[model samples]
Target chain A: SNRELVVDFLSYKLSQKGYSWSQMAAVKQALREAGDEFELRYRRAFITPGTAYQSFEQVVNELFRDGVNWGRIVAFFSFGGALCVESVDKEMQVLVSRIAAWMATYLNDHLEPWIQENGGWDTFVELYGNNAAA
Target chain B: SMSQSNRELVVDFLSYKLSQKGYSWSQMAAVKQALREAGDEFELRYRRAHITPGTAYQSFEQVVNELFRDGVNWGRIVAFFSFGGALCVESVDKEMQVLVSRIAAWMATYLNDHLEPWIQENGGWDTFVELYG
Candidate 1:
């Protein structure tokens, strides 16, 4: 809950740095100038490929099925390991999906504050608001 | 005067900047200050007209460029001393934090360009550089 509140703060705080839909046109132009530089860096590093070694869906199913090395697999996947050598295509796919999910979660965490700005709920609100509403 | 959208735009640019340069948290502080100034300027300019997206965005880049120029070596130093040296150290060891910040502030005031870089060619401050690089 505390972690969730921090996410909300960071998002709102980052907003002060200038992120708006209205300014999209201009930001797009500016981004164009620097866009190639960003694309080169980010596309290579962070973007996920469409095909995974194993679908995360399949991995979860297998976790219950195999049940062996589940913890190791989970830990490896959680911390950005590629899992390319696990001898299991399914595990690899699962790892990619987990990483993708983690990235999405991280983005949500960082952007949580912005999400909350327009009457969205943060942990602080959840904790306090639940009590108040009740 | 920063609308939520405006803030997001600035932060996005800053985020990009940070990612590109491998900016340390201390360095981010200087960048943040420059952005804050840009936000203030935008609010002032747009106070009359609903600030067009173009103008607002340009202002943001202009600030980034200015900060980039002015920031260079000195900005990291400012961040190192202010945030990393002072705040982080203080959080752990208050007395050492005081000592480090005080010394860093003194270096900033008197040493100016003479002070060493926080991150060397390899990475981190002088001590870290010595250890690693």
Candidate 2:
């Protein structure tokens, strides 16, 4: 359920940004590449509170080091959200709300205008929206 | 030129934020890299300011206004906000939540209104260096 929620949210964001099914596929592939290690690390950090773990800040900075990538970003957030759901259910609301707010701000500032100028939301929908189901 | 007191305030605020959150050396280094890539002079000033002890500040607004009072550009503003946002992520203080939310909203609005289209046409954030750097 948590995984679905993450996928849904990421899908909404990717769609808004005009990401193609191909892009989504790439993201899914990267998540697979991220492998079980990704989920395990998050679980260790956020769920079990393992002593040896990177903070969320560290994780995100690494993710965005070169430039922004929609797929990797989606995977990171999805994994993070899932970790919260699985471990710290009580704090999930606050954590997700914080993350969502931050993400909305980031998208609005960093991505939406670019998408608008490139093709506008309607154009994006025409090109990629239908392919999301594939 | 920015006032010495204001500089100290920023340094202190950043230091306090880092101290409060128990930020790692690596995280600080990352912030330094982010600031350096953001601008040269601002990064130098910011890094230098870090050596000084911070004074008490009542709120985020106070720090921001004082730092930007010299009529600096938005790049510096964005740099400061990014640093603050990172700090907020590790902060446990409830007050930080409101501060971060407000900061995020402001950054989003500013980018949308002023910078995003330019970024798009020029080929995204990597090219942003040619314009700002």
Best by lDDT: 2
Scored by CA lDDT, what does every candidate get?
0.34, 0.40
lDDT of 1 by residue, A1-134 (tens): 21222222222232333321123423422432334433444463632345453454455344336432313222222222223212123433333334445434433444345445644322322333233332
**Location of the lowest summed lDDT over 10 successive residues in candidate 2 chain A:** A1-10
List the candidate 1 regions with Cα displacement exceeding 4 Å. Answer: A1-54, A64-80, A83-99, A102-134, B1-83, B94-133
Residue pairs with clashing backbones, model 2: B12-B54
All models, DockQ values?
A: 0.03, 0.01
Interface RMSD of each candidate, angstroms, one decimal: 15.1, 19.6
lDDT of 2 at B63: 61
Q: What DockQ results for candidate 1?
A: 0.03
Best by DockQ: 1
Cα RMSD (Å) per model? 18.4, 21.8
Weakest 10 consecutive residues of candidate 2 chain B by summed lDDT: B49-58
lDDT of 1 at B21: 42
